[PDB]
Amino acid sequence: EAASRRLRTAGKTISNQSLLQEVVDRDALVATKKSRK
Amino acid sequence: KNVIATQLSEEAQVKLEVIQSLLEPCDRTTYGQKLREAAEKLNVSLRTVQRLVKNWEQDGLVGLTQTSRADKGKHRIGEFWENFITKTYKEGNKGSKRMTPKQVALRVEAKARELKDSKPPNYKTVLRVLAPILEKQQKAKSIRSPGWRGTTLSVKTREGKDLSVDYSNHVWQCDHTRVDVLLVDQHGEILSRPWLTTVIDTYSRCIMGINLGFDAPSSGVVALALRHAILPKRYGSEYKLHCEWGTYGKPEHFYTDGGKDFRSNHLSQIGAQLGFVCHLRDRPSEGGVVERPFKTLNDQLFSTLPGYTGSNVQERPEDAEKDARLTLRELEQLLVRYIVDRYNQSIDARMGDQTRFERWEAGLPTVPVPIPERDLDICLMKQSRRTVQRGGCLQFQNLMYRGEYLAGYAGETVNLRFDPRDITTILVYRQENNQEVFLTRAHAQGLETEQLALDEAEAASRRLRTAGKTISNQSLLQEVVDERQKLEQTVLRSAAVDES
Amino acid sequence: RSNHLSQIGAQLGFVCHLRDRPSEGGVVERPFKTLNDQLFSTLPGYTGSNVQERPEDAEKDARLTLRELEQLLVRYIVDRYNQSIDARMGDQTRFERW
Amino acid sequence: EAASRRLRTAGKTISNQSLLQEVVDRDALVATKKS
Amino acid sequence: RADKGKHRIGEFWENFITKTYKEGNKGSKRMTPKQVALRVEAKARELKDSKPPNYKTVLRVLAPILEKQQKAKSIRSPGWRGTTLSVKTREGKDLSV
DNA sequence: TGTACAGTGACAAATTATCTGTCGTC
DNA sequence: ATGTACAGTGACTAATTATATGTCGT
DNA sequence: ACAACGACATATAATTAGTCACTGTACACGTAGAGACGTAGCAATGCT
DNA sequence: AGCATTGCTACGTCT
Numbered sequence A: 001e002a003a004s005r006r007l008r009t010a011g012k013t014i015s016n017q018s019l020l021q022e023v024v025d026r027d028a029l030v031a032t033k034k035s036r037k
Numbered sequence B: 001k002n003v004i005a006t007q008l009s010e011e012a013q014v015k016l017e018v019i020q021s022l023l024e025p026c027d028r029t030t031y032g033q034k035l036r037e038a039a040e041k042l043n044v045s046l047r048t049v050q051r052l053v054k055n056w057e058q059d060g061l062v063g064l065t066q067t068s069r070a071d072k073g074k075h076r077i078g079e080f081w082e083n084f085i086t087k088t089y090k091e092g093n094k095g096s097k098r099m100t101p102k103q104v105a106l107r108v109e110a111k112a113r114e115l116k117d118s119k120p121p122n123y124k125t126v127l128r129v130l131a132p133i134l135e136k137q138q139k140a141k142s143i144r145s146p147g148w149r150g151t152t153l154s155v156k157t158r159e160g161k162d163l164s165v166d167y168s169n170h171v172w173q174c175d176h177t178r179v180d181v182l183l184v185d186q187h188g189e190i191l192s193r194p195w196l197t198t199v200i201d202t203y204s205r206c207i208m209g210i211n212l213g214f215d216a217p218s219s220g221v222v223a224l225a226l227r228h229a230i231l232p233k234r235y236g237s238e239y240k241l242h243c244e245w246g247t248y249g250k251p252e253h254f255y256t257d258g259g260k261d262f263r264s265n266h267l268s269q270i271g272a273q274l275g276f277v278c279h280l281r282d283r284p285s286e287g288g289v290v291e292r293p294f295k296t297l298n299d300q301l302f303s304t305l306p307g308y309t310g311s312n313v314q315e316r317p318e319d320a321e322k323d324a325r326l327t328l329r330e331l332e333q334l335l336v337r338y339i340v341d342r343y344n345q346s347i348d349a350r351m352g353d354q355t356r357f358e359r360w361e362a363g364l365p366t367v368p369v370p371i372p373e374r375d376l377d378i379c380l381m382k383q384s385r386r387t388v389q390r391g392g393c394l395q396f397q398n399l400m401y402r403g404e405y406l407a408g409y410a411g412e413t414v415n416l417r418f419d420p421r422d423i424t425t426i427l428v429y430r431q432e433n434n435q436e437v438f439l440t441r442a443h444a445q446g447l448e449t450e451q452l453a454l455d456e457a458e459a460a461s462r463r464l465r466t467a468g469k470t471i472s473n474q475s476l477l478q479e480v481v482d483e484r485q486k487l488e489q490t491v492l493r494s495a496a497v498d499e500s
Numbered sequence C: 001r002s003n004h005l006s007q008i009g010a011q012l013g014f015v016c017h018l019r020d021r022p023s024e025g026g027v028v029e030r031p032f033k034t035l036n037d038q039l040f041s042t043l044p045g046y047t048g049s050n051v052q053e054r055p056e057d058a059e060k061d062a063r064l065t066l067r068e069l070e071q072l073l074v075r076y077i078v079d080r081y082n083q084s085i086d087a088r089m090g091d092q093t094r095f096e097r098w
Numbered sequence D: 001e002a003a004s005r006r007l008r009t010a011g012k013t014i015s016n017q018s019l020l021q022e023v024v025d026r027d028a029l030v031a032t033k034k035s
Numbered sequence E: 001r002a003d004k005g006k007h008r009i010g011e012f013w014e015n016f017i018t019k020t021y022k023e024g025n026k027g028s029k030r031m032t033p034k035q036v037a038l039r040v041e042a043k044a045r046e047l048k049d050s051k052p053p054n055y056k057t058v059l060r061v062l063a064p065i066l067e068k069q070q071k072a073k074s075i076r077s078p079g080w081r082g083t084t085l086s087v088k089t090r091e092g093k094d095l096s097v
Numbered sequence F: 001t002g003t004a005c006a007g008t009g010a011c012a013a014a015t016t017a018t019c020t021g022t023c024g025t026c
Numbered sequence G: 001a002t003g004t005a006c007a008g009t010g011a012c013t014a015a016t017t018a019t020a021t022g023t024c025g026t
Numbered sequence H: 001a002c003a004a005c006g007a008c009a010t011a012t013a014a015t016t017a018g019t020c021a022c023t024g025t026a027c028a029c030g031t032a033g034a035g036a037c038g039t040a041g042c043a044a045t046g047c048t
Numbered sequence I: 001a002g003c004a005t006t007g008c009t010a011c012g013t014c015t
């Protein structure tokens, strides 16, 4: 358990807040594409 | 052999509690007298209680419970008809035939009429007999594979040899997938789904480069992926990336799907010129380090984009061609942002300790040499067993050529290297001391005011000759310059060399 | 929707009508599946009703010719399909209801 | 129950003799197949 | 209890989850709950909300919606019965047979 | 020892619906 | 009011037959 | 001694095998094949 | 004289 809790705590350490920028700007791009008709 | 009792029922608990109430020891003459309470408690004679004691003292909780019957799972139709059913079904489902239990029952009834059997197996009897077979072949369909664990890994090759993966850049992989996105030209008609070809570092599970484009799986595609994989990266401020795709440098191996471009001469020339060894994949599963990222990337990216096309024809969503809206100059930016700002920083699925990126930078055996860009653009495609003319001149694919230093040589076997995207010039090579040595750079006769590609010159030679035109570089060039692939190629014309 | 067929109808004496949608066609769409299940699936080289379902060796097992498949399909229709009960009626075989 | 039983008992009287013999003859034909 | 089947994330998040999944599955887009939860994470961070819903809640929010979208595949047609029959022409004229 | 991500079971933490007391005149 | 209709299913029921019971037994 | 395992013949009941009325579900043109890169057929356009 | 090289066409064969 305590060994597996190392893997869990290590994975959870990611500074993910800089990684979210992809998702919101990908959607913003797709919403910027209006259809041809 | 240990066997444990399970599904202890209420009646078994009733039977157990009286057994426990007589597990308390006493003299045998009162033992045979205190157990009399069981008689009405079980509504049965003490001779059954003596039998129950004989079971429990012999068998514990397992024999205290009632068994299944001896005929459970035994079919009273007998071995002939149970053989007949399982014979008929398995032979009826060999190869591409797919007989079903209903079709089997018709065979049973047919054979019974021949046998004059008064009472052949009913269809539901025939269906019952096959239920074990259907279930056993169902479970055989979905068995999970463990996958590798920890840092140690080795990759099986079609050679039979198994090759360990020891450090970052020890073994790269590639394959191509058809992207599940319909995307469109400028202003935008539907075109068709592109191909994606990726380089994956088998140690870090990292991803050093991709080529995305409408081009079919071809050695020029693989070469342009390696041209991306191997070079240092610089992406323009128009991407607004947060992270830098710092993976570069060269492989010691290239382990790959056995596609015809991966088996090509051109790539083998790259293997010799860059020092990696091409290794073939045995079966698709061994590729999983690159097969699976298509699944990962389909799920986390393409499925969210307007032109998504589903994982199969049978799942193909009908709006895909109704509102496909990206061009590849956007799909590139989406895919590149997904890799560099997310996927590079994503955790490696069986290390946990670090990102995909850090298992590359910390795992490579030593800092690789960043090669000159022009050197890979000297690792062009080459042609051999051709000959130089007895003059200052040359030929290639019905083009005609000049060369500055060729006049010092008589007509002799020559080797030559060319950019298929800029066949305006060739680099020429000689076999001095059994080693390749430069002759000269060379040019098509009089060609300087414009530039030419190989694919359009090849197509022009077809319309050139079939019209009976006099064959020359002069006339061939006109048939280049006098459409689906035109739209596709002029999309791919959008390139970072104009933007960096 | 061809002129040829509409001209046959005018000659032979029937009007040509089109269904709204395939569901309204079920009376004709269904015998295919009764053929698909009860005939084509039990023959060498059955190709499976879908790309996700083609047998792994349909091309390897492929051996029937057009004259042979027709000679079976006619035995199926004459001795079997038309002799089955009409599924609305239960009492009448499809030919006796004709 | 009676409506069903009459409907069912009608269906039971239909002879499969043709519908059955074609089944073994289809296999006896296909038994000649080799790739 | 009166609370069974009703979530505690509240009216704003119950909508935002279901809004985001609904827009992500029109056209050929096929945004699954995980991508919604990843949007929820992004939304809370930009909302400055310190307690975004967990992916298990987001999957439980959509579970009835997913089942309603599933049931539509199964709905059976009664069919015609007995002797009387007609066929539906696209002219709109039911031709008796 | 293919790969590995989205979905799911079994459970703990937290919330909170509501149902169980000792009670008061009815 | 009504797409089609066959193969597979469930929920019993008739027949089989494995084996639990009650008395005697030594 | 008499409470221990037999010797039943007969119930007891849990197995299978069979009857039916329901119902889900595919029938709706559709993957054989595009598109690369050989080993091997070829012509040709040169020339000594 | 001699072939000798050069630019197509299969017929797979693979993804």
Ligand SMILES: [Mg+2]
Pocket: B175, B176, B257, B259, I015
């Ligand atoms: Mg491949």
